Amino acid sequence: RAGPVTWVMMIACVVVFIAMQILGDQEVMLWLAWPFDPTLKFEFWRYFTHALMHFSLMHILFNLLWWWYLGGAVEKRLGSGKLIVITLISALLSGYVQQKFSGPWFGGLSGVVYALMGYVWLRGERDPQSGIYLQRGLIIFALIWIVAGWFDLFGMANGAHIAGLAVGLAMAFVDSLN
Ligand SMILES: *C(=O)C[C@@H](NC(=O)Oc1ccccc1)c1ccccc1
Ligand SMILES: [Cl-]
Ligand SMILES: [Cl-]
């Protein structure tokens, strides 16, 4: 079963998403979003908490599905610390790129997922002995989501997703060295 990081992240995302139903998107964004005024630049959770917000049912459902599967695999085979670091860095870098290109009003686990699939894929592609790999059907399911978001077929930006992917590829690369 899904490890503690995999589990606690899912719960947090659910709780936050409930809060957004109860209070509206904007009001929750007022507290958790990337600093959107210099008044807020020292509220440090915000460099991370933006990842916890989702705006539709499908957003949180698909994000959490991929998180549960990939994140859960990473936690189980490579440990909780690994998953924590991939998450922290991908969240920060994709958040950074996103706000740079389009301002601070955004949310979600997408950057983190791009990192996890970049990680699992490259890791297995370069080092099967690790035990982790993105099997063919999932490489296909994954690419279809990459394509979708890329050409804006679902409504959700590219640069931030690339930024997330770069983090996962970078860490898989490093991890698969000796
Ligand atoms: C974030 O990108 C939202 C997006 N989630 C998604 O694309 O997840 C994946 C899956 C596989 C590889 C990369 C990213 C999304 C779009 C539309 C509906 C739900 C979620
Ligand atoms: Cl398969
Ligand atoms: Cl490792």
Numbering used by the authors: 92 to 247, 250 to 271
The publication says:
Rhomboids are evolutionarily conserved serine proteases that cleave transmembrane proteins within the membrane. Rhomboids are a family of intramembrane proteases that use a catalytic dyad of serine and histidine for proteolysis of TM substrates. Here, we describe structures of the Escherichia coli rhomboid GlpG in complex with β-lactam inhibitors. The inhibitors form a single bond to the catalytic serine and the carbonyl oxygen of the inhibitor faces away from the oxyanion hole.
The carbamate substituent is a phenyl (inhibitor L29), isobutyl (inhibitor L61), or a cyclopentyl (inhibitor L62). We have included two data sets of GlpG soaked with L29, which are similar but differ in map quality in certain regions of protein and water molecules. In the first data set, which diffracts to 2.2 Å, loop5 is disordered, while in the second data set, which diffracts to 2.4 Å, the main chain atoms for residues 245–247 of loop5 could be modeled. In the L29 and L62 structures, the carbamate oxygen of the inhibitor hydrogen-bonds to a water molecule, which in turn hydrogen-bonds to the side chain hydroxyl of Y205 and backbone carbonyl of W236. In the L29 structure, the aromatic ring is rotated ∼90° when compared to the L61 and L62 structures. The larger hydrophobic groups such as phenyl (L29), benzyl (L59), or 4-chlorophenyl (L60) inhibited GlpG more potently. In contrast, introduction of smaller and less hydrophobic groups such as a cyclopentane ring or isobutyl group showed a higher half maximal inhibitory concentration (IC50) value. It is evident that the best fit for the S2′ cavity is achieved by larger hydrophobic groups such as an aryl ring (L29), explaining why the smaller isobutyl group is less active. GlpG inhibited with β-lactams L29 or L60 showed 50% recovery of wild-type (WT) activity within 6 and 3.5 hr, respectively. β-lactams with smaller hydrophobic groups, L61 and L62, required >24 hr to attain 50% WT activity. In all structures described here, a water molecule (in the L29 structures) or chloride ion (in the L61 and L62 structures) has been modeled close to the covalently bound inhibitor.
